[PDB]
Design a protein around this ligand. Sequence first.
Ligand SMILES: O=c1ccn([C@@H]2O[C@H](COP(=O)(O)OP(=O)(O)O)[C@@H](O)[C@H]2O)c(=O)[nH]1
Ligand SMILES: O=c1ccn([C@@H]2O[C@H](COP(=O)(O)OP(=O)(O)O)[C@@H](O)[C@H]2O)c(=O)[nH]1
Ligand SMILES: *[C@H]1O[C@H](CO)[C@H](O)[C@H](O)[C@H]1NC(C)=O
Ligand SMILES: *[C@H]1O[C@H](CO)[C@H](O)[C@H](O)[C@H]1NC(C)=O
Ligand SMILES: [Mn+2]
Ligand SMILES: [Mn+2]
Lengths: 281, 279, 5, 5
Amino acid sequence: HENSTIAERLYSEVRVLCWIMTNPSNHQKKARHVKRTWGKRCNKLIFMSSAKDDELDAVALPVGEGRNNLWGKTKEAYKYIYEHHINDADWFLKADDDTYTIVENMRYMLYPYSPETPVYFGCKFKPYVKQGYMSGGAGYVLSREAVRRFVVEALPNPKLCKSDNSGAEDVEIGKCLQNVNVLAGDSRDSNGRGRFFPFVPEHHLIPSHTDKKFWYWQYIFYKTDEGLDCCSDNAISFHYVSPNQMYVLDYLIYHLRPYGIINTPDALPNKLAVGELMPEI
Amino acid sequence: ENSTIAERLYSEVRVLCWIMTNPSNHQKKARHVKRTWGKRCNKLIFMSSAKDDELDAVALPVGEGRNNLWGKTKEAYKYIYEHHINDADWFLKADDDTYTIVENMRYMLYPYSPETPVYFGCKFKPYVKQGYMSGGAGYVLSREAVRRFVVEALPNPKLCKSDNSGAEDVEIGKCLQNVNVLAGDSRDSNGRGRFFPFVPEHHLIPSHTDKKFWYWQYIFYKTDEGLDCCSDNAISFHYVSPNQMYVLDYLIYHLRPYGIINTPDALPNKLAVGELMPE
Amino acid sequence: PDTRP
Amino acid sequence: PDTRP
Ligand SMILES: O=c1ccn([C@@H]2O[C@H](COP(=O)(O)OP(=O)(O)O)[C@@H](O)[C@H]2O)c(=O)[nH]1
Ligand SMILES: O=c1ccn([C@@H]2O[C@H](COP(=O)(O)OP(=O)(O)O)[C@@H](O)[C@H]2O)c(=O)[nH]1
Ligand SMILES: *[C@H]1O[C@H](CO)[C@H](O)[C@H](O)[C@H]1NC(C)=O
Ligand SMILES: *[C@H]1O[C@H](CO)[C@H](O)[C@H](O)[C@H]1NC(C)=O
Ligand SMILES: [Mn+2]
Ligand SMILES: [Mn+2]
């Protein structure tokens, strides 16, 4: 048994809308298994595709397929969400169909922040954007105010926001959001451990690639060696998670526990004023 | 965070864990058992054919090779009886690719008297009337079970196979049946398994639906497995790689969903000597 | 029988 | 460039 009263209270206080980037080839292979595992824990779940689907209730964006249209799907998805859902949630998560999210830990992190604060969160990378951008795979989450500025202020200005549908989806949104004064939040826990991860847990717990010019060690905004220390007790996301591994993470995180070791929740910080972030780590 | 209940069971249900390994595996596998779940046992012993400073490995007078594993099991339980029989209540055999949630083992064992002749594990039906326990999944003997094994079965070649060849887990299954040690039932009160011979994915998502697979024929209690397979207090998985030991550690002990507080089921009442749980 | 993989 | 595992 579990007492989930605290997490049910945050469910209603911190509404998270989760949108999942997918394509028809992945509808049954991947997207389905996101819906059956972590997806159903979101306040609102939306599959953003190029074609409709009964099972997912998928939204067909007016955007072709291929890696060359991911940026066009991101733009159309946030436009759609602004059009139809901007008052349906406080926070707007973009994830892939190989992202795994512990939604309860996301609400924990977001609790203090005003949805009216222009900010987004994720795994922060250094290149192409002065204030950093967030890994598309690890998932990144925008405030209501961040989604407003994106759709109302960035998209209509080609100088601020790339108008072609080509490019790294996560770099491009990073640029649009810096250009409309949306802050790149710090998603690390109060001990400085990461919460958003672009790889599976093993790859962060046991880094095999050893600072050998591998892109990750050059991209990471906050310097860390990772290892057994890498990862918060309230980590939020992992990526390159296989459909089967979605169900295993669900089992080991939500179900399996060592008898007589009771997780005691850290106290919730006090709510912040509009425009204010937590003290830096 | 609050580990009061688990600290209380630590002292009330003493578990000695021995790990079957060999010199080739000392650094590749055995080390990672010690650094993860091994240190949560009341007593940890590596049972090898050669010594090792890091592990403090016991060198059994037994050659290497899969045809001497039965010889290592016999010599390990002899050693444990000789030197450790009153150092613990329960005596776990595991491989160096077994992963054990030791706190969940204490939970299962709490009600049982160490003086009851019983052992537990993943129960298989062939070769032994009352069944035998998977060597990989790990199996745990009562003090009274270890006494009977070393003092009553080992000396008697009619009760207990004296050559060092054969399936280690089948052979101990036979020795223990012959000295009236009971094959306990390690399933939880909802009938979900706690001891598993494969990794979690293989039980959560059974791939060999191919029902000719040996596992579906060997299993003593009927189950479909699937997303239902596995207890919230599962005890062991097997064919766990050294790296996967650290992942299971992290996901089980460290990562948790904020504001979902695991509330422990109340401990059953202690049982009389000779008594098993019902159902 | 050998029930290893 | 792409940046994979
Ligand atoms: O032609 C494509 C290729 C990928 N995707 C989606 O884009 C994201 C990136 O794909 P993937 O996870 O395969 O690669 P990654 O970028 O994480 O290496 C995922 O949400 C995919 O479902 C897509 O919609 N159409
Ligand atoms: O020549 C050998 C082969 C295996 N083992 C040990 O025997 C057990 C079973 O082997 P493994 O886990 O490799 O295979 P499994 O039998 O589980 O399929 C392990 O604890 C190994 O360390 C050994 O001591 N000597
Ligand atoms: C790696 O960096 C590229 C740009 O160089 C993209 O932003 C890509 O999405 C990144 N990969 C991950 C997993 O975040
Ligand atoms: C499979 O069965 C054989 C005997 O047929 C051995 O007991 C072997 O150890 C078993 N494997 C597992 C993983 O329990
Ligand atoms: Mn991906
Ligand atoms: Mn093994």
